[model samples]
Target: ADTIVAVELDTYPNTDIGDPSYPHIGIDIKSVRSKKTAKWNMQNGKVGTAHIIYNSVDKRLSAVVSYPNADSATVSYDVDLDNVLPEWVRVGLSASTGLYKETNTILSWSFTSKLKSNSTHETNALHFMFNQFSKDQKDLILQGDATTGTDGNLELTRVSSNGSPQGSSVGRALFYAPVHIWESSAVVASFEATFTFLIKSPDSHPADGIAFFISNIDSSIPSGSTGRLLGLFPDAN
Candidate 1:
């Protein structure tokens, strides 16, 4: 599991959960409920500058948002990182926008700190849950007729091109980066993965299901491969 601590700029306020109806800024720690929030509008075709500053003396986290048109707001909260985060961690920026939402255009960004640096960290995590697929969708690829479902899930084909039982529709999803299972063909890493999937059909009997496969980095779907083949091999026989 991942622990999330963030200062977010929320433009689309989902009032379903009693969020502000207007664009707002928030300070969220460990969960979805923001400890602090301030209404801040982000106009289109304009550059909005957002700044987050942590005062070590007061242990206060403040967020300031400003635009050239004079639209701006400030929000803050008190948090002691010594009690919140690990002794050391990475600092970065992140944003998640939906298909029908207004886009957040970044003109520039910068992060500076006076603290000491450590070089002992190695990044290698490949687990994911798909309820919020837009967050890390860039690192993954969707091919064939596959797309994200309305529930924000990886939706494979449910029908063939002719809309009948005899169909050729195929959906494929894979990692854009090559994963390492062996190094120098001498050493292999050890890990475990657990996930749940569904094998469904509109008919009384399902024809086929999905597969978790690993192939050469340059490999692609077998040409014209479809159902009962798992999209992995050809049926020229």
Candidate 2:
């Protein structure tokens, strides 16, 4: 029942890592018609400011945020909004403190969302993007050769022989993230995914391999989850 939505907030940052003073703030937008949800985060900052906007005509949601300095660091992302209907938009915020030090100063914030008529065509699909993730998004589990390396096992970048692919020895990286693709009707919706990757190996005998899979169980990562098994099945141990 609103034409536009907006809010303002201010906060301070933590003193150090695990100082128990850092704050975690999350913004959630729930769609009334499509039952879809959009989320954003604001981690601990010495000083923080944020601006959010939603365009009803084109169906785009965007946010710009700065933490620490006026322009020292900023984060932004855009989300396509074809799945949600704008009858009445729901906006919510939740805050929590982590183990980091934070200032008690004013943490500034702003937000806005708008409503519009329904579109003629829409896709009942959900999409996700991952360049980096927070600790809370820990659903992404790593195992096998992915557990050790110089640059750390999480990024899975090519480096020394121990973690990178070289020689006859096999170095595998298995990543798993859980998702709820089933609807309340108990029906698994059809989905399409496209991935672009690179594989390199020794000129003599390349042993590089990659696999993309979907499983009913996300936690069933097999033991010694590497080699040709591709982390899909457990070893006979």
Candidate 3:
């Protein structure tokens, strides 16, 4: 996880205290030439250390400005992402200095954004705890023995009955909707998913483990896929 979204500057200028002409640095999420997304001063305004944190889940941008031996201030911005965010949504910096302009240094600079998910899966992505699924929900396409039950739990594999031991059966399900990972138009786009299941073994032996996965389209399961491959990349020798 690359926590640092960006770092604009490093060094600072040793300017006179309370100098109105001291350097001011600004960070822009849109265009540097346009309005500033955020800005701070070198030795001017309430001077100290500044930190920034972004939460994509709530579409919030937050900042903390601390002054030496003084109270710190926090500011937050509600990033309006009503529509899809563009890929290269300009991120830049600008500086303003007077006649006494020195090589103003930015002791530290950093920006961070969430990794698109509660875990690894993007929040906009689809997720379902099978146990919570309802039979009336037509979004899930179940195949083979995959079925929903009284408790609204999804049963992928079933125990074999004396008269019906369908050996080596495969159960599968897919979500009909597509998820916008924001990968094509955002700086960070990744996904992660997790599910809980039980592998019942009646004879002290179970076939193997199960795999929860995602794919582009609903399709047929590979003729022969099991174990580590998890029915994915069948041709991945």
Candidate 4:
């Protein structure tokens, strides 16, 4: 369930709480009814301004709006920030002008506080997890010696098991986004990754092993890469 408190300059009616007769500013909580409503008749093109404020000290969340048509209203309710909001909340705006060329502008917006900007030490981890079986590979860079094969299954080195045994091969599966390993080179931003892999040789004498390498984005397979080299080291200039 998504918990949200919003002020909407409602245009269409939805029976969402029978949505107040015509266009009205509905103060909503959790997508519920416009508990507190202010008549809003936009399209006057003047400057439909809405000023919303949550006074943490007073424990009240209020919205005072005025439209270009010289219509105005005040709708607010007592709300404890500590109780109404989670420890962290995203502040953003979302709107749509379907099938119509429109203008959505916020001349100015600001949040005055000690914004951490997501700078929290992770084990230091990003707490990221991805499953290879899923069909989303947009963030994956699969190159050299590999193929998704006939069924989109990853094959590190898809060599012909029946045909003549091939020579020197390597595969590289890279992540599109880079992880932060250094808060600063002087010390360390600090990080660690947790991963699980299942490497098998259905019927073999240890064909090869796989690697979870962390390297520069431009990493490439060195020429002449083959057995024992694990395809992870430089071949030389």
**Index of the highest-lDDT prediction:** 1
lDDT of 2: 0.28
- lDDT per residue for candidate 4 within 126-173, as digits (tens), equals 333343323445655666655443233444554465522233555655
* Range of the 10 consecutive residues with the lowest summed lDDT in candidate 4: 96-105
- The lDDT of model 3 is 0.35
TM-score-sorted candidate list, best first: 1, 4, 3, 2
- What are the models' TM-scores? 0.47, 0.34, 0.40, 0.42
User: In candidate 1, which residue ranges exceed 4 Å CA deviation?
Assistant: 116-237
Q: Against the correct fold, how does model 2 do in TM-score?
A: 0.34
For each candidate, the alpha-carbon lDDT, in order, equals 0.46, 0.28, 0.35, 0.42
TM-score of 3: 0.40
lDDT of 3 by residue, 1-237 (tens): 000121111112222311122222222232211122223332332224555454345655455454567664444556533232432222211121112121111222222223353345444333433336666648666654455542455545433343121334445555545444344434444333223332233222223223333233434455453322223323323
Choose the strongest candidate by TM-score: 1
For model 2, the superposed segments whose C-alpha errors exceed 4 Å read 1-125, 131-139, 147-177, 184-188, 235-237
> All candidates: CA RMSD in angstroms?
17.3, 19.4, 23.2, 23.6
Clashing pairs in 4: 122-125, 183-189
lDDT of 1: 0.46
Tell me the tens digit of each residue's lDDT in model 1 across 133-226: 4424685566565554324445444333442322355555555554443222222122222222333333433333333333444445555545
